[PDB]
């Protein structure tokens, strides 16, 4: 009843699961054998483990065990009448006589035994058959979940502030990178028990081993308080990543209108398609149409129950903005997870229920029907989210907004090789193979200065611009030195901004971005500027911004990282590189060394 199920691979009823595999998949008699015989996975589960029942034995390898009446024995402890649990390309279990088997085992083995530390592992997880994607997605996430248990605890050494801390890390264990992708639960001890105190994110500070912190319950901290990286249980998947597509000749689901604010006249042509299809992809480019577009489908389809989602709390909220304008605040909810990451977002009280517009993160989603579902920044999503979305909302249609030339989901575990955009999730693969459905562009926040920079052979092709070159070009080609925190510093690279364009008067209200963390710091030391990194630079509008590369290391020179640094400006940009072959695509004017003071 817990022990019987569909083969993950051929679908045949079975009473065998793999126990080596963390997600304990069901495997029928044939696929189980194809799986165990050539991998290191030798533990098979039924209602009991396939192991030697002889007291004192430690044989667990299904390929050396025999059926002993109704238990299992090694060669040694085997009864005289007894046959092997492996025989003739099958493991013993129920429904031998029925089971279909599969030519999908090469990937299933590969997915089940890899370790997720290699770009390769993620390509298999997106190029595989749809069912295996659910298997991989799950496998990957439970793997990231349990890997958190490898890291040290942090203890509060000193409460400097409202905002700052001193942590001591537990000795002998690695300490996790400090950033918003890592979320610790806080703890305090009485003199008799241990009591939770909220969740916390941490960031490096300027001077000293001082760290910034945000928290969920404003409870003021002690010395002795401590933080653990909490590993959560991972639920099984079920819905596909993408449903299978349906093309229509009419407009199904709900009833469009003839009363669109005439500002949306230009998007009528795409709202077209959302009627014609089961799901539709929309690229994309920053600034923006995307934030606007998502709204014009409500007005175009004024009776449509619509559910708006993303992974990021930020983006889900940013879409109540641009949506409490155009849309009636009354008939629309907007809801909350287990704990607000920092300070979040809610609606009317006493609750139950929801209808017309719901705004929610993939995690906090409920079981609901919609007519349309909008998934906001899918380039940030993973096939685990895709599955979950699809499994919690029965939609008639799915629009997926995003642009694959911007930033991807963090892969904790991924420390070797690099992901191309196509391998982010199921949808990004489409947008980078059969092209994005309905492109848009339009660019209403950036000067054609850089609009047609990123247009060139730098991941976009044909984008165009509204504003014109009302800015200033830039180029530079010497290479400073580095002091390789673990992150590297290039202060002689920032040394050439210091006293050459400083000459510019009121045009001094600028932001500083740069690739890494430690050369991101030396902006509050010398020069003095309000600095924000690339990972912060999303949706927020800026004027004067400057850019300092490094050695390359194409992690600084990742072309998607770089697109979402330069598209974050209105007035003026200037760039100082390393290059030596990168200027063949950035279209500006070169400048030199002895004319900068
Ligand atoms: Zn099978
Ligand atoms: Zn296995
Ligand atoms: Zn034995």
From Swiss-Prot:
Impact reported for residue 421 to S: In strain: Isolate GZ50 and Isolate SIN2500
Impact noted for substituting residue 445 to C: In strain: Isolate ZJ01
Chain positions recorded as Zn(2+) 11 binding sites: 7, 10, 28, 31
Coiled coil: none
Domain (+)RNA virus helicase ATP-binding: 259-440
Catalytic reaction equation(s): ATP + H2O = ADP + phosphate + H(+)
Effect of residue 324 to S: In strain: Isolate GD01
Binding residues for ATP: 284-291
Residues binding Zn(2+) 13: 52, 57, 74, 77
Residues binding Zn(2+) 12: 18, 21, 35, 41
Limits of the CV ZBD domain: 3-115
Cellular compartment(s): Host endoplasmic reticulum-Golgi intermediate compartment
Domain (+)RNA virus helicase C-terminal: 441-597
Function: Multi-functional protein with a zinc-binding domain in N-terminus displaying RNA and DNA duplex-unwinding activities with 5' to 3' polarity. Activity of helicase is dependent on magnesium.
Subunit structure and binding partners: Interacts with nsp8 to form the replication-transcription complex (RTC): nsp12, nsp7, two subunits of nsp8, and up to two subunits of nsp13.
Name this protein carries in UniProt: Helicase nsp13
Annotated gene: rep
């Amino acid at each position: 009843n817990s022990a019987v199920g569909a083969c993950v691979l051929c679908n045949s009823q079975t009473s065998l699961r793999c126990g080596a595999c963390i997600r304990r998949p069901f495997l029928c008699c044939k696929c189980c054998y194809d799986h165990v015989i050539s991998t290191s996975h030798k533990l098979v589960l039924s209602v009991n483990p396939y192991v030697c029942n002889a007291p004192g034995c430690d044989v667990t390898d299904v390929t050396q065990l025999y059926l002993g009446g109704m238990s299992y024995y090694c060669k040694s402890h085997k009864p005289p009448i007894s046959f092997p649990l492996c025989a003739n390309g099958q493991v013993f279990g129920l429904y031998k006589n029925t089971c279909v088997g599969s030519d999908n085992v090469t990937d299933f083995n590969a997915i089940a035994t890899c370790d997720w530390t290699n770009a390769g592992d993620y390509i298999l997880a997106n190029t595989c058959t749809e069912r295996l994607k659910l298997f991989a997605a799950e496998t990957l996430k439970a793997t990231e979940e349990t890997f958190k248990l490898s890291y040290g605890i942090a203890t509060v050494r000193e409460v400097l502030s409202d905002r700052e801390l001193h942590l001591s890390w537990e000795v002998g264990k690695p300490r996790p990178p400090l950033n918003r992708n890592y979320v610790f639960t806080g703890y305090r001890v009485t003199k008799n028990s241990k009591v939770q105190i909220g969740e916390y994110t941490f960031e490096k500070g300027d001077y000293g081993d001082a760290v910034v912190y945000r928290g969920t319950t404003t409870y003021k901290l002690n010395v002795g308080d401590y933080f653990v990286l909490t590993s959560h249980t991972v639920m099984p998947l079920s819905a596909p990543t993408l449903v299978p597509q349906e093309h229509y000749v009419r407009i199904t689901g709900l009833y469009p209108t003839l009363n669109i604010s005439d500002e949306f006249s230009s998007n009528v042509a795409n709202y077209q398609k959302v009627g014609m299809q089961k799901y539709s992809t929309l690229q994309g480019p920053p600034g923006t149409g995307k934030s606007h577009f998502a709204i014009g489908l409500a007005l175009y389809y004024p009776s449509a129950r619509i559910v708006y989602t993303a992974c990021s709390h930020a983006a889900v909220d940013a879409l109540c903005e641009k949506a409490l304008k155009y849309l009636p605040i009354d008939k629309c909810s907007r809801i909350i997870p287990a704990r607000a990451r920092v300070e979040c977002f809610d609606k009317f009280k006493v609750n139950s229920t929801l209808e017309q517009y719901v705004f929610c993160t993939v995690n906090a989603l409920p079981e609901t029907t919609a007519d349309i579902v909008v998934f906001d920044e899918i380039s940030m999503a993973t096939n685990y989210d895709l599955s979950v979305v699809n499994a919690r909302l029965r939609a008639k249609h799915y629009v997926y907004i995003g642009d694959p030339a911007q930033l991807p989901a963090p892969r904790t575990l991924l420390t070797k090789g690099t992901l191309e955009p196509e391998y982010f999730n199921s949808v990004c693969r489409l947008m980078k193979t059969i092209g994005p459905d309905m492109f848009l562009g339009t660019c209403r926040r950036c000067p054609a200065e850089i609009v047609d920079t990123v247009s060139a052979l730098v991941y976009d092709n044909k984008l165009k611009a509204h504003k014109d070159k009302s800015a200033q070009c830039f180029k530079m080609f010497y290479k400073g030195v580095i002091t390789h925190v673990s992150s590297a510093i290039n202060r002689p690279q920032i040394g050439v901004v210091r006293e050459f364009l400083t000459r510019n008067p009121a045009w001094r209200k600028a932001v500083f971005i740069s690739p890494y963390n430690s050369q991101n710091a030396v902006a509050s030391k010398i020069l003095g500027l309000p600095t924000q990194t690339v990972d912060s630079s999303q949706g927020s509008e800026y004027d004067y911004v400057i850019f300092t590369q490094t050695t390359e290391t194409a992690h600084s020179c990742n072309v998607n990282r770089f697109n979402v640094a330069i598209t974050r400006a209105k007035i003026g940009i200037l760039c100082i590189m390393s290059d030596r072959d990168l200027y063949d695509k950035l279209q500006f004017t070169s400048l030199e060394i002895p004319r900068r003071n």
